[PDB]
Structure formats: C-alpha cells, structure tokens
Design an enzyme around this catalytic site. Structure first.
Site, short mmCIF file in Angstrom:
data_model
loop_
_atom_site.label_atom_id
_atom_site.label_comp_id
_atom_site.label_asym_id
_atom_site.label_seq_id
_atom_site.Cartn_x
_atom_site.Cartn_y
_atom_site.Cartn_z
N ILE A 1 -3.11 -13.09 26.50
CA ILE A 1 -2.11 -13.98 27.13
C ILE A 1 -1.75 -14.98 25.85
CG2 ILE A 1 -2.77 -13.71 29.32
CD1 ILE A 1 -3.97 -16.37 29.28
N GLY A 2 -2.58 -15.33 24.98
CA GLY A 2 -2.20 -16.39 23.93
C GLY A 2 -1.69 -15.65 22.86
N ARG A 3 -2.50 -15.21 21.80
CA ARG A 3 -1.99 -14.32 20.70
C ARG A 3 -1.14 -13.33 20.97
NH1 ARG A 3 -8.06 -15.09 17.84
NH2 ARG A 3 -7.86 -13.02 16.59
N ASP B 1 -10.06 -17.88 13.74
CA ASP B 1 -10.75 -18.01 14.94
C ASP B 1 -10.26 -19.08 16.05
OD1 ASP B 1 -12.53 -16.44 13.76
OD2 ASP B 1 -14.17 -17.64 13.62
N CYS C 1 -5.02 -8.92 22.65
CA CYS C 1 -5.80 -9.76 21.71
C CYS C 1 -7.34 -9.86 22.66
CB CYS C 1 -5.44 -11.07 21.36
SG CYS C 1 -4.64 -12.08 23.12
N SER C 2 -7.85 -10.83 23.01
CA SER C 2 -8.82 -11.20 23.73
C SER C 2 -8.43 -10.91 25.23
CB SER C 2 -9.79 -12.23 23.48
OG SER C 2 -8.94 -13.59 23.57
#
Length: 497
Positions: free
Chosen positions: A425-427, A387, A421-422
């Site tokens: 950009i990150g994952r 998470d 991902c959500s």
C-alpha cells in the site's frame, strides 16, 4: 462518512482537557505528533490514555493493537480488541477546525475568491473564507449557472455558526454539510447548490518547480486535506475477512476491496476457497497495475496463478526479502539458472542483470504439462529503498520506472504490471502514483495539467491506503519535479548542440 474524530492542530494537554470537559468514558480522538507519529487519545474511567500510532511508510502500526491501511479503517475496526497491562472506542470527539477541508480557504479576500470561482469554478462550485472584515465571521462564496458568484455571510456567535437565521451549528463543517443536503434558495428562486469545492491542487506540469517551492514554504496541509477524504473510501472488504482467507493476508486488517480485487479462476475443487489473493487491479481514471502484498509462503502458488491468468509480463518488487530482521516477502522466484515448480506453475530464472539500485531477473513462466503456455516475465527488484522513510534523491526510482515502462511498452498484449512491497500500500502506492503522473507527461509533453492528490484519491478508491505518509507524498512531488527538469534539460542540450 465524517473523519471529524481527527484534530490536525491539537496538543497533548489540549486533547486531555477536551476529552475530560466535552467527552465521556469511551470518547476518543486521533491527533498528529516528534513528527511522523500519531496518537489515539481515549477516555476511560475518568482518565485519558494515549496510544501511539507509527507509520514509517508501510501501514499504521497501533501499539498493543493491529496494523492498518488508514486511520479511518483503524477506527471502523475497533468501533465494530484494545487492551492495557481494555480500551473502548465508543464516541468520536468531533473537531471544529476547518483547515483540512477542501472548501476552506480562509486567507482569501473578496476579490480573489470571485476571480478563482470565475476562472476555475463551474456550476455548484463553492468556497468558505474568513471575513473581511467583520472579524470572527466567515463568507460562503458559491457559483451558479450566463453565471454568477453569490456571497452568503456566516456569523460566528458564541462559538456557533449561522447564515443569519434558522439553525446554529457547532462548526463550519456542520453548517456546510447541512446546506449541501438542504440548499439555500434566493429571493428570486436561485438554488445555492453546494455541489463540489474549488480545485486548488491542479497545476501545469511545467510549473511544478514553483508549486514545490510554495508547498515547501504547505506539503503537510495539502496531504492532511487529502487524508480527510479517506472516510469516503470505506468500501467492503468481505472476501479478505473470510475465515478460509485469513492466512492469505500479510496483515489481517489490510485487505483488498471486493469490487477491484483480483479473482483467481481454475484453482482446485478440493480447497473450498481458491479464488483469493490480497491484490487489486489499479485502473487509472491504457497501462494498468496489480497492487499486491509481498508473498507469504502459503501464497507463492496463488501469486503465480495471478501473474499467468492476468497475462502480466512485468513484476515491480520494491522491498528486500528481509528488512530490520523481519520477512517482508518470501522468495517466489528461483535462483539464477534454476527451474522451480510452484503448484501448477513452472518458473525458470533465465538471467539476472544487476544495476546500482535494482536487479533484473528474466523469468520464464508456464503451466506444468502445458506446452506453448510459456511467456517471459521481467522482474525488476528495487533493492536500495530505505528501511524507514523515502530516498533523498528520486533519480534512481525514476531511472528504474523509465526502464519498467519501456519493457512494458515493448510487449504486445502484456497484462497489468504487478507491483508489490510488504503490505502493498505504501511503497506500492508511491511507485504506481509516480508512474501514472509521469505517464501523463510522457504522452502530453511538459505542458499538461496534473493533480497529485486527485490521482492519489482515485488510486485509494481501488486499494486501501495507497500512499501511506507525507514523506512519500512530498517524494511523489520531488520525482515529478526531477522528471520535468530532466525532460527540459534534454530539450536544452538538443537546441544548443
């Protein structure tokens, strides 16, 4: 253009004194923190207020504000609303610390600086180091070209910096930027052009283990130097800002760059704007990617229009549909053995195969009322990502990406690999970056040149804030290390069998 408002080595009380003595009402700065967190320190009515920014790996979440791709996009937004129980970002409070600059070494000696500029540097390559020993002073070393390494003395007199004459600068950055635009001319005519800084990040893939350990002794400093370069990536995001596109974005301020966005064709004339999706084409500079956000219920149809139009055969999902009680991605695929219509698109879930870290769904995609348009789309849904933060071991991610690469390679004429991902950009950034770096090692072998922050910067120029945190940055290094180790172990086993 600057990012001088970020102070990497400041404390709470130090930031307060700085805003009260060197700033006015509307003055602000950003600072790191209890690590992983950031603070926006703003002066208002003779008082300093601290606003918390958190980043667990998806976006910069500003308390009482919005979610952003970068601290630079956060600052640009408020400078072009923030409220209490009204906070104004009017004047950035500039930092003089040159530690996050590409051209700043400091630690380097005269002999070492010359050696590095000879073997690594080219024409226009420059660096700034500390003297050496005229304590307090700095030394600018430049390469021009037969070639030569020229040394320029930088005196630090009463907090200001100079080259022995002319203007006196508040910082080494102000001095460097001035001489970049207005070059110094030698006695015999040689122009001391400050074209590009010295590359201190490119390593040989085989020597990853040594660099990982030297960075473990460095990882934060290397990330922040890369972070300081985001102000060069504030490209227009106009299409995503359009009134009719506002509800197609998972986070209103995390938008695709206009120059790399996925443009959707053959939509519907009745809906005025049918060409938009929060997605960008990621071209490494063979295998391309589409970095996108998790579906919203009103974008599932546009998602399928994208996959079909782009001729994509592989979908990489790096989130659960729900995380911490929040919807991260609407279910855009049908249940196993079920057939669903998503607007003009039809999707059949042929078979589901479960592995430890992921689920593979074999989908069949076609246009309704259009025979022969059917193609198989393989959805690799990674389920075990934590998470917050990143996984402890990169084995599962690497096994997942190897499998994704083999499927993509096995398909003739396959389009970009869709990765989401959500916020995307990150994952999403982490997975595409690991996959790009591993692709280099796959073709060129264990002994090839790799440059982790250079690759991230190239990917960030194609979609805002790709790779969000220092945790992901370190995880990218750990995944490349684990891949090289696993590749060498395979050579060990063969020669000994």
């Amino acid at each position: 253009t600057s990012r001088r408002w970020f102070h990497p080595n400041i404390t709470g009380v130090e930031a307060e004194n700085l805003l009260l003595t060197r700033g006015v009402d509307g003055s602000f700065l950003a600072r790191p923190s209890n690590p992983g967190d950031f603070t926006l320190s703003v002066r208002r009515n003779g008082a300093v207020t601290h606003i918390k920014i958190q980043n667990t790996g998806d976006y910069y979440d500003l308390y009482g504000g919005e979610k952003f791709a970068t601290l630079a996009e956060l600052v640009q937004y408020y400078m072009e609303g923030q409220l209490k129980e009204v906070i104004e970002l009017k004047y950035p409070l500039n930092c003089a610390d040159p530690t996050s600059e590409r051209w700043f070494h400091g630690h380097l000696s005269g002999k070492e600086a010359e050696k590095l500029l000879t073997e690594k540097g080219k024409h226009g390559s420059f660096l700034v180091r500390e003297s050496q020993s005229h304590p307090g002073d700095f030394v600018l070393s430049v390469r021009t070209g037969k070639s030569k390494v020229t040394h320029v003395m930088i005196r630090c007199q009463e907090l200001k910096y100079d080259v022995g004459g002319g203007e006196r600068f508040d910082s080494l950055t102000d001095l460097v930027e001035h001489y970049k635009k207005n070059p110094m001319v030698e006695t015999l005519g040689t122009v001391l052009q400050l074209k590009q800084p010295l590359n201190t990040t490119r390593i040989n893939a085989a020597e990853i283990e040594s660099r990982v350990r030297e960075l473990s002794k460095g990882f934060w400093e290397e990330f922040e130097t890369l972070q300081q370069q985001e102000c060069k990536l504030l490209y227009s995001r106009k299409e995503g800002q359009r009134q009719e596109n506002k509800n197609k974005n998972r986070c209103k301020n995390i938008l695709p760059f206009d120059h790399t966005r996925v443009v959707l064709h053959d939509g519907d004339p009745n809906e005025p704007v049918s060409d938009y999706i929060n997605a960008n084409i990621i071209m490494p500079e063979k295998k391309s990617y589409i970095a996108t956000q998790g579906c919203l219920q009103n974008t599932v149809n546009d998602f399928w229009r994208m996959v079909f139009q782009e001729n994509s055969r592989v979908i990489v999902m790096t989130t659960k549909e729900v995380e911490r009680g929040k919807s991260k991605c609407v279910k855009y695929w049908p249940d196993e053995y079920a057939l669903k219509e998503y607007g003009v698109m039809r999707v059949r879930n042929v078979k589901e195969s479960a592995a430890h870290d992921y689920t593979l769904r074999e989908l069949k995609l076609s246009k309704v009322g259009q025979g022969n348009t059917e193609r198989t789309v393989w959805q690799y849904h990674f389920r075990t990502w934590p998470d917050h933060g990143v996984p402890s071991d990169p084995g599962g991610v690497l096994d997942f990406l190897e499998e994704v690469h083999h499927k993509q390679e096995s398909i003739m004429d396959a389009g970009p690999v869709v990765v989401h991902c959500s916020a995307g950009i990150g994952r999403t950034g982490t997975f595409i970056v690991i996959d790009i770096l591993i692709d280099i090692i796959r073709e060129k072998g264990v002994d090839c040149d790799i440059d982790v922050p250079k690759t991230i910067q190239m990917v960030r120029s194609q979609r805002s804030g790709m790779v969000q945190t220092e945790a992901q940055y370190r995880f990218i290094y750990m995944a490349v290390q684990h891949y090289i180790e696993t590749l060498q172990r395979r050579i060990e086993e063969e020669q000994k069998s």
